[PDB]
């Protein structure tokens, strides 16, 4: 499944965090600069909580232009919130890629590779269907090797990842995976 949790870490990269915190205190120092050029620690307090948006609520920047600086600041904070939102979008939708196994027309099965192994029961009525045809002739040629005595064994084997795939009649297997 490989998709879940990762918590406060997942929705960002460490570098981004460095930007948020470090540059946060930075722009704070900028605000204090705007104070002392023409509410000191309380300032960095104010912007810190601003990015927190938790309502510390001591006071505000006096300088109008600087108050616009913090204005754009809080804007970028909203941008960081939204950032967490789209992050969450990644945290939910758009799952991993295909599982292959598209069915009998799967190119995968069309050209046997040592990569994937797909087969059926030794002396299978299934195989009997596979015997007289032109198309699978390659396949039937490839499928004598790993075939097994009892399909249950196959269930075990892929269940141990010793098989890539197995060939049988559906309902039985619907029951099987339906179980496990």
């Amino acid at each position: 499944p490989r998709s879940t949790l990762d918590s406060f870490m997942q929705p960002f990269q460490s570098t981004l965090w460095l930007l948020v915190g470090l540059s946060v205190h930075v722009v704070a120092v900028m605000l204090y600069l705007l104070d002392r050029f023409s509410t000191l620690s309380s300032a960095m307090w104010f912007s810190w909580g601003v990015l927190l948006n938790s309502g510390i609520g001591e006071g505000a920047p006096r300088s109008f232009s600087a108050r616009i600086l913090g204005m754009v600041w809080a804007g970028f904070a909203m941008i960081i919130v939204a950032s967490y939102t789209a992050n969450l979008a990644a945290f939910l939708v758009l799952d991993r890629p295909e599982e292959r196994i598209t069915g009998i027309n799967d190119p995968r099965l069309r050209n046997p590779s040592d990569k994937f192994i797909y087969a059926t029961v030794k002396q299978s009525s299934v195989d009997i269907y596979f015997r007289r045809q032109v198309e699978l002739s390659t396949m039937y040629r490839h499928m004598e090797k790993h075939n097994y005595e009892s399909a249950a064994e196959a269930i075990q084997a892929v269940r141990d990842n010793k098989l890539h795939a197995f060939i049988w009649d559906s309902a039985v297997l619907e029951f099987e995976a339906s179980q496990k």
């Binding site: 990269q13 050029f37 232009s65 754009v72 190119p107």
Partner: protein, 281 residues
């Protein structure tokens, strides 16, 4: 990973809507003095521009604060606008990184960029034998990157021993189909340099030419070629109309938006010393 989403997709959710936010925001600023009977308005409705920040006390005006409710609905609605912006991040993947073109610039001057960039092909490449006519410096620099065999080359791309690779579209397509996971693809949609194709050449100065010609002509006659690729060329991967996705929420670009922030704060320093200069007279 990607992709190329510098927080302005939110502006695609808005664009001139923001201009309306400025203008109508000033309209509300007029509504402050209107329902009253300065910057307080700014910190107030601009307070609504997101979650409250400015501690500044609300205006005691009953109808005034009712207008504050108006810009309140406006505000939450706007938060929704950004919700759908994040949605625009959900879909909308460019899935484009180094794709440029055969003659394009980013590959034109290897020494240009800072990190060493490398790409190339196998020796004696028919395709390459064209590449020499394409540009000389290309063959020259790529000589050091030449590689023997296709497979281990691929393994070097997946591993990262090389950036990208040059060849005919054939193995690009087919090999592109078959891989353990779905990762690599050609640059772009399949835009191909040196429009050409496979066929069967024969002993020159024969008559059998026209005959086999008409033959494989008939081969598209039945369209059996459909069956043919069906047994061979059919890919599992790609269908690049789907944009895939990413994770980790790793954005250098959005950090670029943060750079727009900081630079804006620099502008605030400019106008800051400017208004400070206005204090003389």
């Amino acid at each position: 990973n990607g992709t190329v989403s510098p927080s302005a997709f939110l502006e695609p959710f808005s664009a001139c809507v923001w201009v309306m936010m400025f203008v109508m925001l000033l309209i509300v600023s007029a509504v402050a003095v209107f329902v009253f009977e300065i910057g307080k308005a700014i910190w107030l409705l601009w307070g609504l521009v997101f979650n409250n920040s400015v501690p500044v006390q609300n205006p005691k005006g009953t109808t005034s604060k009712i207008m504050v409710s108006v810009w309140a609905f406006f505000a939450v609605i706007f938060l929704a606008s950004y919700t759908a912006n994040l949605a625009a991040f959900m879909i909308q993947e460019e899935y484009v990184d180094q794709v440029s073109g055969l003659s394009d610039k980013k590959f034109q001057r290897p020494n240009d960029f800072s990190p060493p960039f490398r790409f190339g092909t196998v020796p004696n490449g028919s395709t390459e034998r064209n590449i020499r006519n394409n540009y000389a410096e290309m063959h020259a620099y790529m000589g050091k990157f030449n590689q023997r065999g296709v497979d281990d080359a691929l393994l070097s791309l997946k591993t990262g021993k090389l950036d990208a690779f040059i060849y005919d579209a054939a193995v690009l397509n087919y090999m592109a189909g078959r891989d353990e996971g779905c990762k690599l693809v050609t640059i772009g949609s399949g835009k191909v340099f040196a429009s050409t194709g496979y066929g069967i050449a024969i002993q020159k100065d024969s008559g059998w030419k026209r005959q086999v010609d008409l033959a494989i002509l008939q081969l598209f006659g039945d369209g059996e070629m459909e069956e043919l690729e069906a047994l061979w060329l059919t890919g599992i991967c790609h269908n690049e109309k789907n944009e895939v996705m990413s994770s980790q929420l790793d954005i250098d670009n959005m950090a670029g938006v943060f750079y727009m922030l900081g630079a804006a704060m620099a502008l605030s320093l400019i106008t800051f010393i400017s208004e400070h200069l206005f204090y003389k007279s």
